[PDB]
Design a protein around this ligand. Sequence first.
Ligand SMILES: CNc1nc2ccc(NC(=N)N)cc2[nH]1
Ligand SMILES: CNc1nc2ccc(NC(=N)N)cc2[nH]1
Ligand SMILES: [Cl-]
Ligand SMILES: [Cl-]
Ligand SMILES: [Zn+2]
Ligand SMILES: [Zn+2]
Lengths: 371, 371
Amino acid sequence: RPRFSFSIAAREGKARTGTIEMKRGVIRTPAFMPVGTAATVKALKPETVRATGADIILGNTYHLMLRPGAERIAKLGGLHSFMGWDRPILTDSGGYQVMSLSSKQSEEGVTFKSHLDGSRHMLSPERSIEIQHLLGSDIVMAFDECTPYPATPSRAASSMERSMRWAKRSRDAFDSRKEQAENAALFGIQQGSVFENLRQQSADALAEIGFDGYAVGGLAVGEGQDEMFRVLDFSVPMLPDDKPHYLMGVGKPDDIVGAVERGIDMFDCVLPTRSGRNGQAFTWDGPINIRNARFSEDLKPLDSECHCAVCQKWSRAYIHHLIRAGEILGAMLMTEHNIAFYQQLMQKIRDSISEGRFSQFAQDFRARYFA
Amino acid sequence: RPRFSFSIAAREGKARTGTIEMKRGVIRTPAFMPVGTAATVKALKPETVRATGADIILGNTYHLMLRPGAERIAKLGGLHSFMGWDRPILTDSGGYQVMSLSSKQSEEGVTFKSHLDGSRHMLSPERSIEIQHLLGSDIVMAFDECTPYPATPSRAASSMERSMRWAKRSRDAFDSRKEQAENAALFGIQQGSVFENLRQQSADALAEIGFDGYAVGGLAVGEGQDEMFRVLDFSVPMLPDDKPHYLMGVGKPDDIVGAVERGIDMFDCVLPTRSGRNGQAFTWDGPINIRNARFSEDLKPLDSECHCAVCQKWSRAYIHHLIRAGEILGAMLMTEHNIAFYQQLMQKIRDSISEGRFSQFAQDFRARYFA
Ligand SMILES: CNc1nc2ccc(NC(=N)N)cc2[nH]1
Ligand SMILES: CNc1nc2ccc(NC(=N)N)cc2[nH]1
Ligand SMILES: [Cl-]
Ligand SMILES: [Cl-]
Ligand SMILES: [Zn+2]
Ligand SMILES: [Zn+2]
């Protein structure tokens, strides 16, 4: 079993489908990664996450370093053993949460106060890589400096250029740790906001360093789908074609389809889990809010085609009751269905690309989903 | 498959072990019934409830008549289909929640305002039985009038005597509904508080009417274990020996053991589910609070002997993290373990009675549990 081997089995336009082979398992691409920020995909046992079709989940350096702690997780045997997920885990590097959740930045790194208890903590390229080593991540993200949306040209350039210097420091720290370099992979993060020249400068710097995969940062932060697709149109071709392309934080089903049409291979977002707990269920006819009174006596499953265990066993009417009553089983069932729906979407994307009918799939998907 | 057949396979002192055969399955006794007040055992799929060893669960007339509604559940196919539990369900009649949760009593019945939205509702012996018919309950409880603890002799007698008249009305309403009389069972509820003469009067009235089983009401309401055991000492022998004896709302593991020693066959309580969500895990060495800092790096399972799936797969340290983080999976894992622990306790009770070593089991259990 290889450390990291990406193979493209089929193409259609800019879209690709294939596999990433890693020591802990195969990742089918395009892939959707359920988010497991606090060492759990919310409301699901790991076996249920696997049963939905997920090949890999996402963890977070920032959250786990605060609770329960990186050294503690390593002492307990690593993140895989701790949470009971034995397949690949990608960990974000913490740069986004430093901006979004915490409350001093320099070239060396960043010091910050935890949002949970105000205790002071430090992150740097070297410390982020070390934390991801302690967690035992399979895909390690380079540590970057993020800037809020909407970013001015000056702030976008400044954070991107520092991110590129930090990408080289992340590369060197990873390569210095033998066990990490032999068993994990390292992805760089392209920045530059909506500005084509900065995206190009960022892509050039990352390719010169060399990574196992390339993420597109700085999207899914409020820009809207038209603008995101515009940025992807020019940004993805700048990345090495022969390595995976990971769009961080995306997204809604239609966002995923359009991003695949633009060359993206990997995705993560909290939408299926978080909005599931809030009562939103994804269906091939668009999302529904199960709390709506129209579902109070609806005996049909959440989605009429979905193969998930929830749709085999429980009605909309029951799940409507559970969510309106605040019952934990409502969160469990909505989340399992939504994650299974996302995996079925990815499976349909992969099959349609492999069969050379992805264009028609995307058209049919949109016509029905937005009808 | 019979409507209702109780068979005692073995005895030791006042303790009994055996089976209740019903159309939807066999109930091994002494039995513990997980509580599923809102058409769910909190945080567990029904298949997980079954995997812990539960033969029967408890639902509630008062809660289900308010949300989602009894006629609605019947229109949707009954409670079993609605929640996905195909085995026996016992439903309490609502008399306790009218007292404990709602906010006018007469000989006919009771009118009350819902605790959820203040809407007005009515309950009576006839309406309670009808609601339990609409739900499709397998074991129907007679509708009683409860009085708060501690009850004066006057209030205990008054509520008991009305309860006995309402027990006859419950019997007649059940017998008038052919489908119910042919497929379900009906239990009476002995009242009389801590007063031996009232317990005797109540037992005499219930036996004259005749029921499939006899519950002991009015305990687990604050009286303490010594007093409860004292009341059981004289109350249980008053009930027909050849029918099941159901102690409502009990209880802690040691309460269950002592009640079995006094002739009780069936139990229900929210303790394993509710306290599980709050961080209390049951072990053979007594309860632990998993949130305590001493468990932060403990790799052992919740209990060293427990056969449940949680103890096969996750450490105390992980569950400690989950509960302290407010994660739903923490509630799921704690609840599964606690319900499995309760079922393993019942299995050890049943086996020890069948083998004529229940006295020694109870002594060994207490010496270790309270060490
Ligand atoms: C919620 N949206 C969302 N977009 C993202 C882009 C990037 C990152 N992380 C990173 N640059 N280390 C996280 C994101 N989260
Ligand atoms: C929580 N304790 C607790 N003791 C109980 C006794 C009786 C009942 N119900 C009834 N008489 N219809 C419920 C109980 N709940
Ligand atoms: Cl989430
Ligand atoms: Cl509960
Ligand atoms: Zn489904
Ligand atoms: Zn266990």
